[PDB]
Design an enzyme around this catalytic site. Structure first.
Site, short mmCIF file in Angstrom:
data_model
loop_
_atom_site.label_atom_id
_atom_site.label_comp_id
_atom_site.label_asym_id
_atom_site.label_seq_id
_atom_site.Cartn_x
_atom_site.Cartn_y
_atom_site.Cartn_z
N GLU A 192 40.74 37.99 46.92
CA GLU A 192 41.46 38.62 45.82
C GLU A 192 40.68 39.80 45.26
N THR B 77 30.54 48.58 53.35
CA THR B 77 30.77 49.17 52.04
C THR B 77 29.86 50.36 51.81
N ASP C 128 62.48 56.02 52.16
CA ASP C 128 62.34 54.99 51.14
C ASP C 128 61.67 53.76 51.73
N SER D 45 55.87 37.10 44.28
CA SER D 45 56.01 38.55 44.25
C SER D 45 54.97 39.22 45.13
N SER D 46 53.73 38.73 45.09
CA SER D 46 52.67 39.34 45.87
C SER D 46 52.96 39.25 47.36
N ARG E 167 28.02 32.11 30.07
CA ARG E 167 29.38 32.62 29.94
C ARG E 167 30.26 31.62 29.22
N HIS F 222 42.70 36.37 29.12
CA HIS F 222 42.11 37.68 29.37
C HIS F 222 41.83 37.86 30.86
N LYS G 273 31.19 53.67 53.54
CA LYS G 273 32.23 54.36 52.78
C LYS G 273 31.63 55.18 51.65
N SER H 256 39.58 58.16 48.44
CA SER H 256 39.53 58.98 49.64
C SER H 256 40.50 60.15 49.55
N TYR I 177 38.58 41.59 46.77
CA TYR I 177 38.63 42.65 47.77
C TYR I 177 40.03 43.22 47.89
N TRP J 254 39.78 31.18 33.96
CA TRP J 254 40.77 31.73 34.87
C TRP J 254 40.70 31.07 36.24
N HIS K 243 29.81 31.87 48.20
CA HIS K 243 28.74 32.33 47.33
C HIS K 243 29.11 32.14 45.87
N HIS K 244 30.32 31.68 45.59
CA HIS K 244 30.73 31.22 44.28
C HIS K 244 30.38 29.76 44.04
N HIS L 225 37.82 35.11 46.61
CA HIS L 225 37.05 36.31 46.92
C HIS L 225 37.90 37.35 47.63
C1 HEA Z 1 36.85 44.34 42.39
C2 HEA Z 1 36.16 43.25 42.10
C3 HEA Z 1 34.92 42.87 42.83
C4 HEA Z 1 34.22 43.50 43.93
C5 HEA Z 1 34.37 44.73 44.79
C6 HEA Z 1 33.07 42.60 44.16
C7 HEA Z 1 32.15 42.87 45.14
C8 HEA Z 1 31.07 42.09 45.43
N1 HEA Z 1 30.74 40.93 44.77
FE1 HEA Z 1 31.71 40.09 43.26
N2 HEA Z 1 32.68 39.23 41.77
C9 HEA Z 1 33.82 39.67 41.17
C10 HEA Z 1 34.51 40.79 41.50
C11 HEA Z 1 34.14 41.66 42.50
N3 HEA Z 1 33.05 41.53 43.31
C12 HEA Z 1 34.25 38.75 40.08
C13 HEA Z 1 35.48 39.02 39.26
C14 HEA Z 1 33.27 37.68 40.04
C15 HEA Z 1 33.23 36.51 39.09
C16 HEA Z 1 34.38 35.54 39.33
C17 HEA Z 1 34.20 34.40 38.36
O1 HEA Z 1 33.20 33.67 38.48
O2 HEA Z 1 35.04 34.23 37.47
C18 HEA Z 1 32.34 38.08 41.12
C19 HEA Z 1 31.26 37.30 41.40
C20 HEA Z 1 30.35 37.57 42.37
C21 HEA Z 1 29.22 36.63 42.58
C22 HEA Z 1 28.82 35.37 41.86
C23 HEA Z 1 29.81 34.26 42.04
C24 HEA Z 1 29.35 33.14 41.15
O3 HEA Z 1 28.41 32.41 41.54
O4 HEA Z 1 29.92 32.98 40.05
C25 HEA Z 1 28.53 37.28 43.67
C26 HEA Z 1 27.30 36.79 44.33
O5 HEA Z 1 26.83 37.35 45.30
C27 HEA Z 1 29.29 38.50 44.02
C28 HEA Z 1 28.91 39.34 45.02
C29 HEA Z 1 29.60 40.47 45.35
C30 HEA Z 1 29.13 41.35 46.44
C31 HEA Z 1 27.89 41.03 47.23
C32 HEA Z 1 30.09 42.42 46.52
C33 HEA Z 1 30.12 43.60 47.43
O6 HEA Z 1 31.44 43.99 47.86
C34 HEA Z 1 29.41 44.80 46.80
C35 HEA Z 1 28.92 45.73 47.90
C36 HEA Z 1 28.59 47.10 47.34
C37 HEA Z 1 27.34 47.59 47.27
C38 HEA Z 1 26.14 46.83 47.73
C39 HEA Z 1 27.14 48.97 46.69
C40 HEA Z 1 27.57 50.02 47.70
C41 HEA Z 1 26.61 50.07 48.87
C42 HEA Z 1 25.51 50.84 48.85
C43 HEA Z 1 25.18 51.68 47.65
C44 HEA Z 1 24.56 50.90 50.03
C45 HEA Z 1 24.22 49.56 50.65
C46 HEA Z 1 23.59 48.62 49.64
C47 HEA Z 1 22.82 47.58 50.01
C48 HEA Z 1 22.52 47.27 51.44
C49 HEA Z 1 22.24 46.69 48.95
N4 HEA Z 1 30.38 38.64 43.22
C1 HEA Z 2 40.91 43.70 35.25
C2 HEA Z 2 40.21 42.75 34.68
C3 HEA Z 2 39.49 42.93 33.39
C4 HEA Z 2 39.38 44.04 32.47
C5 HEA Z 2 39.94 45.43 32.34
C6 HEA Z 2 38.48 43.52 31.41
C7 HEA Z 2 38.13 44.29 30.34
C8 HEA Z 2 37.29 43.87 29.34
N1 HEA Z 2 36.69 42.65 29.26
FE1 HEA Z 2 36.85 41.16 30.54
N2 HEA Z 2 37.02 39.67 31.82
C9 HEA Z 2 37.75 39.65 32.96
C10 HEA Z 2 38.51 40.66 33.43
C11 HEA Z 2 38.65 41.87 32.82
N3 HEA Z 2 38.06 42.25 31.65
C12 HEA Z 2 37.63 38.36 33.67
C13 HEA Z 2 38.36 38.10 34.96
C14 HEA Z 2 36.75 37.55 32.87
C15 HEA Z 2 36.30 36.14 33.13
C16 HEA Z 2 37.29 35.22 32.42
C17 HEA Z 2 36.67 33.87 32.17
O1 HEA Z 2 35.64 33.80 31.48
O2 HEA Z 2 37.22 32.87 32.67
C18 HEA Z 2 36.42 38.45 31.75
C19 HEA Z 2 35.59 38.03 30.76
C20 HEA Z 2 35.24 38.79 29.69
C21 HEA Z 2 34.33 38.21 28.69
C22 HEA Z 2 33.66 36.86 28.63
C23 HEA Z 2 34.44 35.85 27.82
C24 HEA Z 2 33.57 34.63 27.66
O3 HEA Z 2 33.01 34.16 28.67
O4 HEA Z 2 33.43 34.13 26.52
C25 HEA Z 2 34.21 39.31 27.76
C26 HEA Z 2 33.39 39.33 26.53
O5 HEA Z 2 33.28 40.33 25.86
C27 HEA Z 2 35.04 40.42 28.28
C28 HEA Z 2 35.18 41.63 27.65
C29 HEA Z 2 35.95 42.65 28.12
C30 HEA Z 2 36.06 43.94 27.39
C31 HEA Z 2 35.31 44.15 26.11
C32 HEA Z 2 36.93 44.75 28.20
C33 HEA Z 2 37.48 46.12 28.05
O6 HEA Z 2 37.73 46.38 26.67
C34 HEA Z 2 36.54 47.16 28.62
C35 HEA Z 2 37.00 48.58 28.29
C36 HEA Z 2 38.49 48.68 28.55
C37 HEA Z 2 39.34 49.23 27.67
C38 HEA Z 2 38.88 49.81 26.36
C39 HEA Z 2 40.80 49.27 28.02
C40 HEA Z 2 41.06 50.29 29.12
C41 HEA Z 2 42.48 50.13 29.60
C42 HEA Z 2 42.83 49.23 30.53
C43 HEA Z 2 41.83 48.29 31.13
C44 HEA Z 2 44.27 49.13 30.95
C45 HEA Z 2 44.64 50.31 31.85
C46 HEA Z 2 46.01 50.07 32.42
C47 HEA Z 2 46.55 50.91 33.31
C48 HEA Z 2 45.81 52.12 33.78
C49 HEA Z 2 47.92 50.62 33.84
N4 HEA Z 2 35.64 40.07 29.44
O1 LIG Z 3 33.99 37.78 44.11
O2 LIG Z 3 32.94 38.74 44.39
CU LIG Z 4 33.15 36.46 45.67
#
Ligand code: HEA
Ligand code: HEA
Ligand SMILES: [O-][O-]
Ligand SMILES: [Cu+2]
Ligand SMILES: CCCCCCCCCCCCCCCCCC(=O)OC[C@H](COP(=O)([O-])OCC(O)COP(=O)([O-])OC[C@@H](COC(=O)CCCCCCCCCCCCCCCCC)OC(=O)CCCCCCCCCCCCCCCCC)OC(=O)CCCCCCCCCCCCCCCCC
Ligand SMILES: CCCCCCCCCCCCCCCCCC(=O)OC[C@H](COP(=O)([O-])OCC(O)COP(=O)([O-])OC[C@@H](COC(=O)CCCCCCCCCCCCCCCCC)OC(=O)CCCCCCCCCCCCCCCCC)OC(=O)CCCCCCCCCCCCCCCCC
Ligand SMILES: CCCCCCCCCCCCCCCCCC(=O)OC[C@H](COP(=O)([O-])OCC(O)COP(=O)([O-])OC[C@@H](COC(=O)CCCCCCCCCCCCCCCCC)OC(=O)CCCCCCCCCCCCCCCCC)OC(=O)CCCCCCCCCCCCCCCCC
Ligand SMILES: CCCCCCCC/C=C/CCCCCCCC(=O)OC[C@H](COP(=O)(O)OCCN)OC(=O)CCCCCCC/C=C/CCCCCCCC
Ligand SMILES: CCCCCCCC/C=C\CCCCCCCC(=O)OC[C@H](COP(=O)(O)OCCN)OC(=O)CCCCCCC/C=C/CCCCCCCC
Ligand SMILES: CCCCCCCC/C=C\CCCCCCCC(=O)OC[C@H](COP(=O)(O)OCCN)OC(=O)CCCCCCC/C=C/CCCCCCCC
Ligand SMILES: CCCCCCCC/C=C\CCCCCCCC(=O)O[C@H](COC(=O)CCCCCCC/C=C/CCCCCCCC)COP(=O)(O)OCCN
Ligand SMILES: [K+]
Ligand SMILES: [Zn+2]
Lengths: 65, 196, 107, 180, 459, 186, 226
Positions: E230, E303, E90, E152-153, E428, E60, E306, E243, E232, E125, E277-278, E228
């Protein structure tokens, strides 16, 4: 040629054969089965049942069914 | 000043008429340059030597005619007649008399517009200026209004945030009284269970 | 920052006392899904689609000039749906400056 | 009014599902035999021979379009000469009723208006400044607490008892000092 | 032809089509999870078959990130409009563009085939060793997919960078987002490949990097150094789409264009140096933790700029224009949702708070709000904006207020409880749980089944 | 910002200036094919980026972040006992690494730790000074701060002498309560 | 132009092996009926025949001299067409910058087809606005909705063809008196005698007129191994 101006002209001009859409949906359906079928197969392999009964791994009342 | 001074194309001459640089694998022939300089005379020496173009004398009357019809061209033609025109002199002559092409707007067909429409040009420009005047003023008006309104969100956020500050404030007071006064806190109470 | 074109006071003076801003409608009309004819084959439906392009439409002002469909980005300038080959002739991005050269003029 | 009734006549309800009869009744897969339609199937779609099996990009049916003089056919503009001037009349697209169907009447009025722009450069610059430094001040407010709590975790303490914990698949092992 | 086509616009469609197809398997895997977590005790997975659940969560996560969202946002929309936003005709490297989509498909087939043929086990994952290197051959197959996906990426990143050479117009904000994402891939992918090779070495070449005297934490540093960036890389293309949509649908010039561009650049620079921070709970040095915590908070500053610039784009727009279009609603919904996800990210950036919230469903909800709602909705919003240009039909999504409202309500039902569960606490990657967490898990499960039903209404 | 190419742009001397930027901006450019066009495009870029007021805010942020980044990297190599670059100590068993051990204690007592540790009472409600005393002497004895941390700590009073219960929750009072019962030594 | 690659060897001159072997018909073909290779050799043979006859040059008018060398006399119509061709070619790989367009002097947008995409960026300095793209179609005076800049499309079209260098030459250049083969022979004997060939194009051309392989050494010149 006018027919070649648009990419995927038959679809965009609404003349395509519906089978193309069916294959796309079928392909998606098959992709989904890759999560369900191995679940059933693995459950039976290690337990002998395709799906569990809810809370069957815990102690159940006498009248539970 | 390009390609390190090596021209992309240049002329090479051979003394033997039947010579082929690709078929023969001999080692005596020495190629010459466009001016005829043998290859074993390095360019830093040959480029210093002054080479001038010699036309047959039968061309002198023609070169004279060119100078007279175009007096600005006379000094270059005189150099050629007198055997004083180098390659650089020829280049200066060539680029001096090169002119750019002319485009005439009077020959462009115009998009169709009736006589009545052509008389409304000033009106449409007048409308455009008023639109810009209205646009610029509205920008100041809107900027003041909305950025001011943002203060409401700040005040609203501060108030709602202050609600949680008060809850936290009361929470800390309660915690300080748990170990001191709360009957929920008990000692000499939990006994080890022991291994099952 | 951009705040519109600068305007001088003299530019706002009308030539008549009855001048008011022109009330020309910039709503291009009523549209929906492009509706093809069953009789038209693939080639003629392509012609039909090419004749329904909103980005080929404009509004004609009172002086004969037209304000066309305009967009911030060139994504809205290709035929919809996008053809295989879009920009056969390179789109021109027109910049403006105050520089001039004598060759362009004649006395 | 109901604008659908205006172009109801053009829309005749269909007969076959998806617009095709069964292939047995009519073979739409075959290429059309009509003259000038050799590149199309019977149903009007492009034939596989034209697009795949004998695609011109692969060297089939080689026919250079450009002529000897490096020219290709170009359609001229609609020119008119009037009032001592040569004019070009632009091609206006057909009425949107013909292409879309709805009758072009009672169109809501949308006036010309120039771009909506934020003004007052001085005010705008301050807003942009706040957008950057208000979040910065918040970050600074958090920084000092962050340092303090981090130091609390790693503070050197006068511990008097040690418990060793080992994680194994899938149980925990604890080692403790037995009293004398 | 269908496979031989090099047209970038066709390839862009293929990326979108393939992501939807793979999305179904990802949705199925997601649905399996919430059904199991409906209540304590086994529901659809036998206790003797718990290994399958670990594979479900592992796939997943992997499929959704690398095979669904990344191709959709970085491969699908960019390949369609990026050469159009540029004045060029193109893509620069047409043949490379063709092979990139084919590579993605082959890697997908390898992954799903491994489910069917190999024994089903999971390691998350993130593939943390030593668990990843003591597993069965399914782990070997998943590594091949990732490495193949990496090819590919990177080649796609090379393709987009070449637009700078040929661009005949202005570099719009959207173009900047794709370019900077490509830069992140170029710098982060080779590090990922190196560490993945070490995982293969231990799995397949008797290497001893991840046994005693070999620091297992070494993997976490190298992995998250790519991990991380990734996240971003996933979101930055989404920012570009928002935008364009906000400016186009409001007839307002993008405010602070250069500030937007610099914010994207700043995020990438900061995003490349905050990966640890992970790794808060592993026991890093005091000064190291303070550094990463401090720099992680700084990412909010760009952030935030924006976010505010987006808000002023919507403010003051003409009232006469209909605001119920699905693309506009999704773009506005993104701002509301992203703020929730980002704020919770800042909360878990504080390492002492993270001690309690690491490996809990609070982290799940954090990245679902950003990715499962925000990124998906941004991808949906972009596709809807380009409906006329793309030309797809046979769906009711352009003006469907029911779909937008139901989607927003139900996705919030899934993931808001997961924040609460995080403090309760529920770890989790867990199948069973204590009876006293059932209420919140049950509510989220009801949310999951509801969302799937809504998708059927679009057709 | 001038609008006429005839008016020159002022430039300073050094490695980051208008002249320095002009020399290098068009090195890889296919669009700057002549002086007039080159200058127009150069001034277009300079006007758009360097005359944008908000852009300077990001310049400050990158400087600060990079400055911290370089300092932390350098500090680890120079001072962290666990980081080895020289090999003399790595060629000996652990008990013999006397030179490396010299870094331990000073690296354990950075200035900021001493300053901020006394402010633990802004977080802990009960016994905030539970770990203040340590007879070993590797660190200084801690004394609780007299004021709350500046910023967002409105929950507690500005100064701790304003809190009627602060003294009752100190580790000393709790130790008195439990000693009176014979419950525990601490 | 900057977007062109390096000059080829053919960009300077063509090899003699490309000379048409039927020279007698080549010198009698009208200009409109001559291909690129045929036209090149017609001008080179006729041009070099007049230039290699010094005694006649001073008495030859510039009009006749230009005709012999194949150079087109410039006039306002031809100059206009050529100028717009070069402007179109230059804009293929160059920026589009010029004075602000007005009704009196619209911005000229050259195109071959009936349509070309254009962007308006407003005036200079503060008057510059964000890019506004529009499709510039023939026959309409386009007015930017923001700055009111006027654009117009100019089409390089002529009689079912688009303007090219060859098209301009054919339309305006008029064939003069038919080339006389006696001049070719007379100049040939002037510069080619007793195994010395200082006029080689004429030597080949004269040989083709006499058939092929008649003059000394021409049989050996035309015999190839592969
Ligand atoms: C698109 C995906 C995405 C994005 C954008 C982000 C964005 C951010 N993530 Fe996230 N992050 C994940 C995907 C993402 N993350 C995933 C997938 C994990 C779990 C991975 C795993 O463990 O499997 C994770 C995990 C994760 C962790 C925990 C890691 C761990 O211990 O397991 C933390 C801890 O700080 C973190 C922080 C942040 C922060 C600080 C941002 C910042 O970019 C957010 C900044 C945005 C705001 C703050 C809001 C907008 C700003 C304002 C409204 C005004 C200013 C606000 C303040 C000054 C507070 N992320
Ligand atoms: C893009 C990434 C992505 C997306 C869409 C989702 C979507 C969802 N995920 Fe998540 N999820 C992850 C990434 C994502 N997840 C990751 C990275 C983890 C951590 C893995 C790990 O534990 O190691 C995780 C873990 C995770 C867990 C924890 C598993 C565990 O620890 O035991 C659960 C539990 O309910 C969950 C639930 C869901 C549900 C209910 C939805 C969705 O059903 C929410 C609603 C969405 C829909 C109803 C579908 C909408 C359509 C699309 C998303 C496709 C659209 C396609 C195009 C537009 C081309 N997710
Ligand atoms: O990874 O936030
Ligand atoms: Cu991170
Ligand atoms: C996330 C979900 C939600 C999303 C919501 C948001 C969506 C927003 C909108 C997004 C839109 C994006 C842009 C769209 C652009 C579309 C452009 C387009 O249409 O291009 C034209 C393109 C082609 O049109 P064309 O130009 O006419 O092409 C002509 C052909 O080239 C030539 O014609 P031909 O007839 O010659 O064709 C050849 C044909 C020849 O055809 C035939 O011969 C057909 C014969 C019939 C076969 C039928 C299948 C039989 C299956 C039997 C199963 C038996 C099971 C038994 C089980 C027993 C159990 C006990 O096929 C072949 O020869 C090859 C076929 C190979 C591909 C199909 C593979 C199928 C799956 C195979 C699985 C194998 C599994 C093995 C596993 C083993 C493991 C060990 O269209 C398509 O391809 C269809 C696209 C359809 C979707 C369009 C978009 C609509 C909007 C979205 C709708 C929602 C979709 C949801 C996903 C699906 C859910 C399931
Ligand atoms: C020194 C030592 C020397 C040793 C020497 C030894 C030599 C060894 C040789 C080794 C190499 C062998 C292979 C050589 C290849 C040659 C290529 C070439 O030149 O071809 C020219 C040749 C030209 O053909 P043609 O003879 O002119 O005739 C073509 C037709 O007339 C009409 O032209 P066309 O091109 O339009 O027609 C083709 C197309 C036309 O048909 C269509 O496109 C149908 C309409 C579309 C329907 C919607 C499809 C779904 C939407 C997909 C969207 C993304 C598309 C991405 C782009 C396409 C990617 C394939 O149909 C197909 O070919 C099948 C299309 C499959 C599309 C797949 C989309 C995703 C499916 C997702 C499945 C989900 C379920 C999961 C479970 C199953 C997993 C497998 O290429 C082709 O057109 C045929 C290619 C066939 C080979 C494909 C091989 C694929 C292998 C996949 C991996 C399988 C491994 C694992 C098995 C697991 C099974 C369960
Ligand atoms: C003590 C030590 C001292 C050492 C001293 C060393 C001195 C070195 C001097 C260096 C001077 C450079 C001179 C050239 C300037 C650039 C000109 C240029 O590119 O011409 C266009 C030229 C195309 O020619 P064209 O036709 O003129 O282009 C027309 C435009 O496309 C049409 O566009 P337009 O007209 O609309 O706009 C024009 C302009 C619009 O853009 C601009 O004008 C941008 C201007 C700013 C650029 C940055 C300057 C530096 C700023 C200060 C940073 C200081 C940091 C200090 C840290 C200290 C820590 C200790 O367009 C471009 O510049 C396009 C290219 C942009 C590429 C950006 C790539 C990402 C890099 C990150 C962005 C910069 C962020 C700076 C920091 C931000 C936060 C404050 O571009 C190319 O040839 C493209 C080649 C692509 C190759 C890609 C693959 C390369 C390998 C990648 C490896 C991994 C890279 C990792 C990067 C990580 C980034 C975060
Ligand atoms: C013991 C209790 C058991 C209870 C079982 C309850 C089952 C409940 C199932 C609920 C879910 C139903 C899902 C329905 C999906 C519909 C999909 C759909 O519409 O597909 C569209 C798609 C494209 O069609 P159009 O878009 O109309 O194209 C024409 C041009 N526009 O249609 C198709 O491709 C048609 C074929 C799709 C495949 C469907 C069948 C797949 C195989 C299912 C096997 C089921 C086996 C069950 C065995 C049970 C044994 C006890
Ligand atoms: C332990 C093994 C680890 C994994 C190893 C995987 C293989 C190595 C990494 C991938 C190799 C390919 C990297 C990309 C090369 C550069 C791509 C690029 O942009 O080049 C452009 C240029 C083509 O440009 P056009 O599209 O034709 O443009 C025409 C208009 N001018 O690219 C090429 O020529 C590429 C030629 C080779 C194909 C490379 C791309 C495809 C991927 C190859 C994978 C090879 C797998 C080998 C695995 C062996 C494992 C031991
Ligand atoms: C990684 C190990 C490689 C070994 C290479 C051997 C060759 C040495 C020469 C090339 C490498 C440069 C290092 C030379 C060091 C010379 C002096 C020396 O021995 O220093 C040792 C000393 C520590 O050794 P120990 O005493 O064992 O540890 C005490 C407690 N920590 O090493 C150091 O402090 C220097 C090592 C780091 C040097 C590199 C610079 C460090 C800062 C990097 C900042 C990076 C961020 C970006 C900077 C931007 C700048 C514009
Ligand atoms: C010819 C071109 C050559 C280019 C070469 C480039 C080399 C660098 C490439 C990127 C890899 C960086 C090296 C990896 C650094 C890892 C360090 C690490 O993990 O150390 C942390 C500690 O590290 C830190 O304190 C974190 C510092 C962050 C290092 C980041 C270095 C790479 C940054 C690249 C960002 C992108 C480029 C930015 C350029 C400038 C932008 C303006 C672990 O600490 P503890 O486990 O507690 O152990 C301490 C003692 N026991
Ligand atoms: K369960
Ligand atoms: Zn304008």
């Amino acid at each position: 040629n006018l027919e070649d101006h648009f990419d995927l002209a038959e679809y965009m001009m609404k003349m395509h054969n519906p089978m193309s859409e069916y294959l796309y949906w079928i392909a998606g359906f098959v992709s989904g089965l890759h999560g369900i079928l191995p679940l059933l197969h693995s459950n039976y392999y290690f337990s002998g049942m395709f799906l569990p009964r809810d809370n069957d791994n815990t102690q159940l009342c006498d009248d539970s069914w | 000043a390009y390609n390190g001074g090596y021209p992309f194309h240049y002329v090479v001459q051979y003394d033997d008429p039947n010579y082929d640089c690709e078929a023969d694998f001999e080692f005596e022939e020495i190629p010459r340059d466009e001016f005829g300089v043998p290859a074993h005379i390095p360019p830093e020496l040959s480029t210093q030597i002054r080479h001038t173009y010699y036309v047959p004398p039968q061309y002198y009357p023609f070169l004279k005619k060119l100078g007279e019809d175009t007096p600005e061209l006379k000094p270059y033609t005189d150099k050629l007649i007198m055997g004083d025109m180098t390659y650089d002199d020829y280049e200066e002559m060539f680029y001096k008399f090169a002119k750019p092409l002319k485009i005439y707007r009077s020959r462009l067909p115009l998009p169709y517009r009736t006589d009545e429409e052509i008389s409304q040009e000033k009106y449409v420009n007048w409308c455009g200026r008023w639109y810009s005047y209205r646009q610029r003023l509205q920008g100041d008006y809107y900027s003041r209004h909305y950025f001011r309104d943002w203060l409401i969100g700040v005040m609203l956020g501060m108030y709602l945030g202050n609600l949680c500050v008060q809850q936290h404030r009361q929470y800390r007071v309660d915690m300080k009284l748990f170990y001191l006064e709360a009957p929920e806190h008990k000692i000499n109470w939990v006994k080890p269970r022991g291994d099952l | 920052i951009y705040e519109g074109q600068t305007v001088q006071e003299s530019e706002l003076i009308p030539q008549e006392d009855d001048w008011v801003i022109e009330e020309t409608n910039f709503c291009l009309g009523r549209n929906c899904y492009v509706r093809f004819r069953e009789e038209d084959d693939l080639a003629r439906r392509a012609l039909h689609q090419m004749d329904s392009q909103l980005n080929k439409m404009h509004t004609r002002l009172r002086d004969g000039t037209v304000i066309p469909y305009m967009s911030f980005h060139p994504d809205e300038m290709v035929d919809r749906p996008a053809p295989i080959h879009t920009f056969s002739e390179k789109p021109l991005l027109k910049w403006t400056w105050d520089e001039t050269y004598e060759e362009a003029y004649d006395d | 009014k109901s604008y659908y009734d205006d172009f109801k006549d053009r829309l005749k309800p269909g007969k076959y599902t998806q617009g095709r009869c069964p292939q047995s009744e009519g073979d739409y897969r075959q290429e059309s035999k009509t003259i000038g339609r050799e590149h199309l199937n019977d149903d009007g779609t492009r034939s596989k021979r034209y697009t795949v099996k004998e695609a011109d990009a692969l060297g089939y049916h080689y026919h250079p379009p450009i002529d000897k003089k490096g020219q290709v056919y170009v359609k001229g503009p609609n020119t008119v000469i009037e009032r001592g001037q040569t004019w070009i009349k632009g091609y206006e697209l057909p009425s949107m009723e013909y292409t879309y169907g709805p009758k072009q009447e009672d169109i809501p009025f949308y006036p010309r208006v120039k771009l909506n722009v934020w003004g007052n450069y001085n005010l705008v610059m301050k807003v942009e400044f706040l957008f950057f430094y208000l979040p910065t001040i918040i970050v600074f407010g958090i920084c000092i607490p962050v340092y303090t709590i981090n130091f609390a975790q790693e503070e050197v303490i006068y511990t008097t008892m040690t418990v060793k914990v080992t994680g194994r698949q899938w149980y925990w092992v604890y080692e403790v000092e037995s009293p004398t | 032809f269908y496979i031989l086509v090099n047209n970038n616009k066709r390839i862009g469609i293929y990326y979108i089509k393939l992501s939807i197809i793979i999305g179904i398997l990802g949705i199925v895997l997601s649905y399996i999870i919430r059904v199991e977590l409906y209540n304590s005790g086994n529901r659809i997975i036998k206790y003797d078959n718990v290994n399958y659940y670990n594979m479900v969560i592992t796939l997943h996560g992997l499929l959704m990130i690398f095979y669904i969202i990344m191709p959709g946002l970085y491969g699908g929309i960019p390949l369609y409009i990026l050469p159009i936003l540029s004045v060029i005709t193109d893509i620069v490297l047409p043949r490379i563009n063709n092979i990139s989509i084919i590579i993605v498909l082959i890697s997908y087939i390898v992954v799903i085939n491994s489910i069917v043929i190999e024994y089903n086990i999971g390691t998350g994952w993130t593939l943390y060793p030593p668990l990843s290197i003591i597993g069965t051959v399914i782990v070997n197959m998943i590594l091949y997919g990732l490495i193949i996906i990496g090819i590919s990426s990177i080649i796609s990143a090379i393709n987009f960078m070449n637009i700078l050479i040929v661009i005949d117009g202005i570099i719009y904000v959207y173009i900047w987002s794709i370019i900077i994402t490509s830069v992140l891939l170029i710098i982060s992918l080779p590090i990922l490949n190196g560490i993945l090779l070490m995982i293969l070495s231990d799995i397949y070449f008797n290497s001893i990097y991840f046994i005693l005297n070999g620091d297992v934490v070494l993997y976490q540093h190298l992995f998250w150094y790519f991990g991380h960036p990734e996240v971003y890389i996933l979101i930055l293309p989404a920012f570009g789409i928002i935008s364009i949509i906000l400016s186009v649908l409001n007839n307002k010039i993008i405010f602070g264009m250069k500030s937007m561009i610099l914010a994207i650049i700043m995020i990438s620079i900061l995003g490349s140096i905050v990966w640890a921070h992970h790794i808060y709970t592993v026991g890093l040095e005091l000064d190291t933790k303070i550094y990463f915590n401090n720099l992680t908070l700084i990412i909010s500053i760009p952030t935030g700029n924006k976010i505010y610039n987006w808000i002023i784009l919507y403010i003051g727009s003409y009232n006469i224009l209909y605001n119920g279009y699905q693309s506009l609603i999704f773009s506005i919904m993104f701002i509301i949702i992203f703020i929730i996800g980002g704020i919770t990210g800042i909360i878990i950036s504080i390492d002492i708070i993270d001690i309690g919230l690491h490996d809990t469903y609070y982290i799940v909800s954090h990245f679902h709000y950003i990715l499962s709602i925000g990124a998906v909705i941004s991808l949906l919003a972009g596709i809807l904006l380009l409906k006329d240009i793309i030309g797809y039909y046979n769906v009711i999504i352009k003006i469907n207020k029911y779909f937008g409202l139901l989607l927003f309500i139900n996705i919030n039902i899934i993931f808001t409880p997961q924040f609460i569960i995080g403090f309760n606490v529920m770890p989790r990657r867990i199948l069973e749980y204590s009876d006293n967490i059932i209420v919140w898990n049950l509510i989220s499960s009801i949310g999951s089944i509801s969302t799937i039903l809504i998708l059927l209404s679009i057709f | 910002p001038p609008t006429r190419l005839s008016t020159p742009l002022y430039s300073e001397g050094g490695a980051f200036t208008v002249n320095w930027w002009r020399n290098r901006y068009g090195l890889y450019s296919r669009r700057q094919t002549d002086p007039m066009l080159a200058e127009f495009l150069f001034r277009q870029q300079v006007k758009e980026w360097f005359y944008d007021v908000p852009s300077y805010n990001y310049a400050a942020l990158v400087g600060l972040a990079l400055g911290i980044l370089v300092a932390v990297i350098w500090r680890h190599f120079l001072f962290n006992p666990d980081v080895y670059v020289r090999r003399q100590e790595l060629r000996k068993m652990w008990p013999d690494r006397h030179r490396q051990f010299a870094y331990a204690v000073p690296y354990l007592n950075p200035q900021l730790k001493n300053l901020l540790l006394p402010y633990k009472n802004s977080f802990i409600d009960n016994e905030p000074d539970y770990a203040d005393y340590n007879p070993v002497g590797l660190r200084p004895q801690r004394v609780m701060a007299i004021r709350r941390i500046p910023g967002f700590f409105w929950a507690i009073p500005q100064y701790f002498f304003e809190d009627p219960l602060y003294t009752s929750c100190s580790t000393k009072n709790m130790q008195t309560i439990y000693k009176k019962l014979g419950y525990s030594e601490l | 132009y900057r977007h062109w690659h390096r000059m080829s060897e053919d960009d300077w001159a063509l090899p003699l092996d490309s000379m048409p072997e039927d020279v007698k018909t080549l010198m009698a073909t009208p200009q409109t009926e001559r291909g690129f290779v045929e036209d090149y050799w017609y001008n080179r043979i006729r041009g070099e025949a007049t230039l290699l006859d010094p005694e006649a040059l001073p008495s030859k008018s510039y009009i006749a001299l230009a005709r012999d060398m194949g150079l087109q006399i410039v006039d306002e119509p031809s100059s206009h067409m050529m100028g717009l061709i070069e402007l179109y070619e230059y804009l293929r790989g160059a920026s589009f910058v010029g004075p602000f367009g007005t009704i009196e002097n619209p911005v000229l947008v050259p195109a071959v087809g009936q349509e070309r995409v254009v962007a308006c960026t407003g005036g200079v300095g503060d008057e510059e606005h964000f890019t506004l793209w529009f499709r510039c179609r023939e026959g309409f005076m386009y007015r930017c909705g923001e700055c009111d800049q006027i654009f117009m499309l100019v089409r390089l079209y002529y009689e079912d063809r688009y303007w090219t260098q060859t098209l301009v030459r054919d339309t305006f250049m008029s064939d003069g008196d038919m080339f006389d083969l006696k001049t070719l022979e007379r100049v040939h004997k002037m510069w080619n005698k007793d195994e010395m060939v200082r006029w080689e194009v004429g030597y080949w051309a004269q040989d083709y007129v006499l058939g092929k392989g008649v003059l000394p050494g021409m049989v050996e010149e035309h015999t190839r191994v592969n």
